[PDB]
Amino acid sequence: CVVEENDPIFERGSTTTYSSFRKNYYSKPWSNKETDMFFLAISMVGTDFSMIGQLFPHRARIEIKNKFKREEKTNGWRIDKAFQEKRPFDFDFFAHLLQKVLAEEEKRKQK
Amino acid sequence: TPPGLQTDCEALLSRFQETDSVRFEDFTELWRNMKFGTIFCGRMRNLEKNMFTKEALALAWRYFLPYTFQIRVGALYLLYGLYNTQLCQPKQKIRVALKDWDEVLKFQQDLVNAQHFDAAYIFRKLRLDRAFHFTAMPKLLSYRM
Amino acid sequence: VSGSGGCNFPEYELPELNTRAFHVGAFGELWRGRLRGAGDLSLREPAADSDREDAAVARDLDCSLEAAAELRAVCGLDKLKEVIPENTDLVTLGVRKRFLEHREETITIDRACRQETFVYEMESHAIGKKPENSADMIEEGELILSVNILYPVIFHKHKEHKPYQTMLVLGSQKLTQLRDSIRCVSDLQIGGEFSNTPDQAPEHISKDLYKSAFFYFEGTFYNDKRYPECRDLSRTIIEWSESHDRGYGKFQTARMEDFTFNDLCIKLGFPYLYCHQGDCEHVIVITDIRLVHHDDCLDRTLYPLLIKKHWLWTRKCFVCKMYTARWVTNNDSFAPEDPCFFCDVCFRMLHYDSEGNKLGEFLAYPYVDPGTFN
Amino acid sequence: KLFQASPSVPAKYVEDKEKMLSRTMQLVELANETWLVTGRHPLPVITAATFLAWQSLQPADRLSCSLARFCKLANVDLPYPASSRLQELLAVLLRMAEQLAWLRVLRLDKRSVVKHIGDLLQHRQSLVRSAFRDLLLPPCMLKSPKRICPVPPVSTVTGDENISDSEIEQYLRTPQEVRDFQRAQA
Amino acid sequence: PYFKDKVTGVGPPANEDTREKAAQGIKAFEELLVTKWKNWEKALLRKSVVSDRLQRLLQPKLLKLEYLHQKQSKVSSELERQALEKQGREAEKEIQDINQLPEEALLGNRLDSHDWEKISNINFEGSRSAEEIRKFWQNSEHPSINKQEWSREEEERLQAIAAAHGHLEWQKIAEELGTSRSAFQCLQKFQQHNKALKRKEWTEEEDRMLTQLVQEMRVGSHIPYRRIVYYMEGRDSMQLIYRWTKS
Amino acid sequence: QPSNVLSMAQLRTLPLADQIKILMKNVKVMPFANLMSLLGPSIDSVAVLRGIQKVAMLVQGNWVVKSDILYPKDSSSPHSGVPAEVLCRGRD
Numbered sequence A: 001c002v003v004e005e006n007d008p009i010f011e012r013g014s015t016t017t018y019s020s021f022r023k024n025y026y027s028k029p030w031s032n033k034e035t036d037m038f039f040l041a042i043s044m045v046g047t048d049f050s051m052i053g054q055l056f057p058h059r060a061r062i063e064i065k066n067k068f069k070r071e072e073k074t075n076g077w078r079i080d081k082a083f084q085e086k087r088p089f090d091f092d093f094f095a096h097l098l099q100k101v102l103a104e105e106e107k108r109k110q111k
Numbered sequence B: 001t002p003p004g005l006q007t008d009c010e011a012l013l014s015r016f017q018e019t020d021s022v023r024f025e026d027f028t029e030l031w032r033n034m035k036f037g038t039i040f041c042g043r044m045r046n047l048e049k050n051m052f053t054k055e056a057l058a059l060a061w062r063y064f065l066p067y068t069f070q071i072r073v074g075a076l077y078l079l080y081g082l083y084n085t086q087l088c089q090p091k092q093k094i095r096v097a098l099k100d101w102d103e104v105l106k107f108q109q110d111l112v113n114a115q116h117f118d119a120a121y122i123f124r125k126l127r128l129d130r131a132f133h134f135t136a137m138p139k140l141l142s143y144r145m
Numbered sequence C: 001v002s003g004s005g006g007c008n009f010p011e012y013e014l015p016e017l018n019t020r021a022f023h024v025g026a027f028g029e030l031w032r033g034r035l036r037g038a039g040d041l042s043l044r045e046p047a048a049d050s051d052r053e054d055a056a057v058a059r060d061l062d063c064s065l066e067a068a069a070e071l072r073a074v075c076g077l078d079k080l081k082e083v084i085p086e087n088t089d090l091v092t093l094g095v096r097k098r099f100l101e102h103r104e105e106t107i108t109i110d111r112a113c114r115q116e117t118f119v120y121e122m123e124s125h126a127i128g129k130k131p132e133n134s135a136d137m138i139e140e141g142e143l144i145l146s147v148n149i150l151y152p153v154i155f156h157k158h159k160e161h162k163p164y165q166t167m168l169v170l171g172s173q174k175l176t177q178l179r180d181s182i183r184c185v186s187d188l189q190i191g192g193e194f195s196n197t198p199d200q201a202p203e204h205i206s207k208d209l210y211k212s213a214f215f216y217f218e219g220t221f222y223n224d225k226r227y228p229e230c231r232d233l234s235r236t237i238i239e240w241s242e243s244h245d246r247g248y249g250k251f252q253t254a255r256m257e258d259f260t261f262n263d264l265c266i267k268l269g270f271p272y273l274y275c276h277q278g279d280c281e282h283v284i285v286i287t288d289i290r291l292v293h294h295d296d297c298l299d300r301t302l303y304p305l306l307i308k309k310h311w312l313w314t315r316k317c318f319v320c321k322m323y324t325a326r327w328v329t330n331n332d333s334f335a336p337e338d339p340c341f342f343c344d345v346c347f348r349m350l351h352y353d354s355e356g357n358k359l360g361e362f363l364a365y366p367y368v369d370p371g372t373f374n
Numbered sequence D: 001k002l003f004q005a006s007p008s009v010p011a012k013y014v015e016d017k018e019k020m021l022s023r024t025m026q027l028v029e030l031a032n033e034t035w036l037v038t039g040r041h042p043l044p045v046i047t048a049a050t051f052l053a054w055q056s057l058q059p060a061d062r063l064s065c066s067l068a069r070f071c072k073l074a075n076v077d078l079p080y081p082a083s084s085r086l087q088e089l090l091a092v093l094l095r096m097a098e099q100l101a102w103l104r105v106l107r108l109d110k111r112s113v114v115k116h117i118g119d120l121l122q123h124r125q126s127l128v129r130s131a132f133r134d135l136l137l138p139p140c141m142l143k144s145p146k147r148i149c150p151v152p153p154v155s156t157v158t159g160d161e162n163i164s165d166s167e168i169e170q171y172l173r174t175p176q177e178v179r180d181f182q183r184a185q186a
Numbered sequence E: 001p002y003f004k005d006k007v008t009g010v011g012p013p014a015n016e017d018t019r020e021k022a023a024q025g026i027k028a029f030e031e032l033l034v035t036k037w038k039n040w041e042k043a044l045l046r047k048s049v050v051s052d053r054l055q056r057l058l059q060p061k062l063l064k065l066e067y068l069h070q071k072q073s074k075v076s077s078e079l080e081r082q083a084l085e086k087q088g089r090e091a092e093k094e095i096q097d098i099n100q101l102p103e104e105a106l107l108g109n110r111l112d113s114h115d116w117e118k119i120s121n122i123n124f125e126g127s128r129s130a131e132e133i134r135k136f137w138q139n140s141e142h143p144s145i146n147k148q149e150w151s152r153e154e155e156e157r158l159q160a161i162a163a164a165h166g167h168l169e170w171q172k173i174a175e176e177l178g179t180s181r182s183a184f185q186c187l188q189k190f191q192q193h194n195k196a197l198k199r200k201e202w203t204e205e206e207d208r209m210l211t212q213l214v215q216e217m218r219v220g221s222h223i224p225y226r227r228i229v230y231y232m233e234g235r236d237s238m239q240l241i242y243r244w245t246k247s
Numbered sequence F: 001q002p003s004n005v006l007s008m009a010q011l012r013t014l015p016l017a018d019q020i021k022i023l024m025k026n027v028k029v030m031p032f033a034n035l036m037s038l039l040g041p042s043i044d045s046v047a048v049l050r051g052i053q054k055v056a057m058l059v060q061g062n063w064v065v066k067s068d069i070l071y072p073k074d075s076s077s078p079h080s081g082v083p084a085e086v087l088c089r090g091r092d
Helices: A032-045 A049-055 A061-074 A076-084 A092-110 B003-017 B024-033 B046-062 B069-084 B098-111 B117-128 C025-033 C050-059 C065-074 C092-105 C114-124 C175-181 C233-242 C344-351 D017-033 D042-056 D067-074 D082-099 D101-106 D117-122 D124-133 D166-171 D175-184 E016-024 E039-074 E079-100 E116-124 E130-139 E153-165 E171-177 E183-193 E204-216 E225-231 E237-244 F008-012 F016-027 F032-039 F045-052 F084-091
Strands: B094-097 B132-135 C012-014 C143-150 C167-170 C213-217 C220-223 C252-255 C271-276 C280-291 C327-330 C340-342 C363-366 F056-059 F062-065
Touching: A032 A049, A032 A061, A032 A076, A032 A092, A049 A061, A049 D175, A061 A076, B003 B024, B003 B046, B003 B069, B003 C092, B024 C065, B046 B069, B046 B094, B046 C114, B069 B117, B094 B098, B098 B117, B098 B132, B117 C065, B132 C280, C025 C280, C050 C065, C167 C175, C175 C213, C220 C233, C233 E016, C327 C344, C340 C344, D017 D042, D017 D082, D017 D117, D017 D124, D042 D067, D042 D082, D042 D117, D067 D082, D082 D101, D082 D117, D082 D124, D101 E039, D117 D124, E039 E079, E039 E116, E039 E130, E116 E130, E130 E183, E153 E171, E153 E183, E171 E183, E204 E225, E225 E237, F008 F016, F016 F032, F016 F045, F016 F062, F032 F045
Parallel strands: B094 B132, C220 C252
Antiparallel strands: C143 C167, C143 C280, C213 C220, C213 C271, C271 C280, C327 C340, C327 C363, F056 F062
């Protein structure tokens, strides 16, 4: 038996209700250094979003795709320069930069 | 609470702490050299002196109840002296709490068998002097102020 | 209905605000039981004294006449410091000297201490006064409760209106005595319209007409049933409280002439209600509970005598500003203000001719200024 | 439930059903004629209109009441854009006040125009006419659109059939990157 | 501080005694108070009066213009259209002149008909009573009120006329005074600058009544000279103090 | 656990003021002696007088209920529908 485990809610007015249409997406904005390292990851990998999402644990692949589409639609010269430049794939230094970004966001939250 | 009276009380409590454990000789020598009681009459107004003495006794009793027997006896007999040297018309009674009476009763029961002869005598004299007036709060308390 | 089960000791509930519930009769009984009494007689001393002191110390815990003599010789007044309090290392003496300087600067001699002298006189009025009859002697250990009765429903949000009146009450006495002793000016106030007939003596004042009155302490409704013209607003109060599940539990109803202060269950520092005349509400705050002492009033016929009073500013005549107003006029053309106030002579000479005919249309009402008791 | 005095809602909030409905109808007709409901949800505008009517029927005791407070009192789900619709309708009412003579001299605001909303709706016809003489579009478009739909530079350069193979080479993945991707996705 | 112990204020029921008090009309201390006036309150009063006057003057013209517009939209005749347009332009010119009139005559005379309750409950949110606003606008805000202080000649004229008037209505007194001021200010300055009536020399019964008062209602050393004056009309505080403090 | 819905016991169980008010609203004509006899001898004559003076008027030695007590402010004429103020004026 439910031993006062839940509390009654005074919601769902019998009169009527309306719609929302926006439930879960609720993305989170980027930053300057984050956009810089994102362009770096682009120049390093390409357009395959699977690897980008695998290497970005704290940001969703859907958000990465939205950012890439927004960049392609607004700043084309930046994407062109990113594709022009290339960098060999690094793993240890990339993890170090990930830890640095974690520390930076921690400091931001502290601020 | 009074700002300066509390400081004077704390200073006298430290002076009694730095003395022997339990001995009226220290009380006598302190009263003789320092004479902590200086601002009793002077040249002040009626209600000013009245509230001065009232707050003095109230705070000195409120402090009476963690510090050792030295501090306890020091506060108690500071109150005793301030009451016995009461040249004013109210003869202001020392404000006490309800359970404080049972506390001091247990204290006397303990003194019955202990090296506190002079202390028990002074407390018995203070009791006979009808100097205690017990309440529920060591001060006055309301909800508007 | 029995009292709320609780210990006599007033255990604290909120920091320096108020304690929990407790009884008054049992509290006083235990208080008198945990003591010996027989000290409210002022019979210390107006010869053989050494033997008496020896017997006293023998019956007591010390049993040492020599030590007693030494201690009493040490504790004397011949060794007590009138003289200027200076020439000694002190702390509060600096504040004292600064206050003396401020006095010599601003205060003139000894005056402007109006409230101070008021408190002094109201406290001295109860010092060693004996009753007229020998049967009116207050027995030892009588409960004395200090009560603050806030009558005004509004206050100065600026200053919070800290000071106000404060009275004393006895435990053994009934609550009807306090009810009748409350000096509420709403009782003296009078209604009705007396514009056409100003010389008509106001009769059947609100005090006599609106006899409805009751108390409220911890969900207990005490309704006065002494007079056959007292209604029961507690009926409608309980109806409203029970018409909906608002979280308020069942409340008990009792008579005010059968329950005394001892049978009450109160909380020191908690506000209770005293409602009469329908909307005239008073906030009751029982602050302290103390026993009777030989230095206090020992006359039971004078225990309700208020110990602290408030200085209520009176409304002066809006016309001359020299006399206190006694009549309030509404919808008056001759009046310079809508809610206007006039005194006797000014109202007579402004609203009536030499013969006394009503000049102009208006609505006059007897205005009983708040400062009527003082 | 502002028609019948219920235990929760005091009597001060209870208003006249017919008058409040007529006021809300006039307000929503004004909104439909001022290009406020077109393209936006209608229910937020209806909520804003009924709230403005309830406040104008007694501005004295309802000057401090808020939209969330009114929704909580009426037991109705507060729409999100209701606040924006209310602000836009208050701006339109302020424009009508500026058009009127006594109101533009009073110099009312979004908080003191609720008491004169009635005078606005009394002759809203000429007021709205003058307001349109001196269209309603989203705030993101009325920010001085100097360059509307800039003409992009037509670039139809096609060459013969292609450009070169350097682009194919820079698109093709190198063996180093292939092995790196394989190690990463192992 | 709060004074809503039992009934917090959410569902306070109006009981039998409360309705009986309301019917009897015993207004004592809370439903008859008054607070000082403020500069922003004066400005709001002026603006509200001006707006109400202008709106009451324009509403008939607005209705007439609406009627003309309806005639134009319903009448398909061309001959009468010229007259309709001429009347519309005449109404427009009338409105233009009404709006161009300076802000000195649109305030109204000292005694004019207005909607005080409407103005109050619309602008002042009911804080200021309709009668209080009426009085404030009639004897404290009209622009024709003389703001300069008295030179004491107005007092001389007022007393000279009152000595023959009888001190009954003092309305004809203020009319004959002729200073472009309100009777309120006139009587205020008069009773502030004149001397006290000085009922009579000190008497034994009066001294004994004051002694009984000092014995029954005095507390300490301070003496309520205002309580004394309340029961003894025709005196002044300073003289009473200086006299009763000695002998 | 008409205006005559309350019985004699339900009436006596109410305060003196309400008792007198209901008796007057029901009868509209009754001497002071009859009112005292109906209310009971244990009630004070001064109390009964103070109660009746607020809801009745003296007419040729007899007491007649006031007009507003019979016709509340929200009531109207059951035959013509005129407001209660006019009915009260006519009865006065």
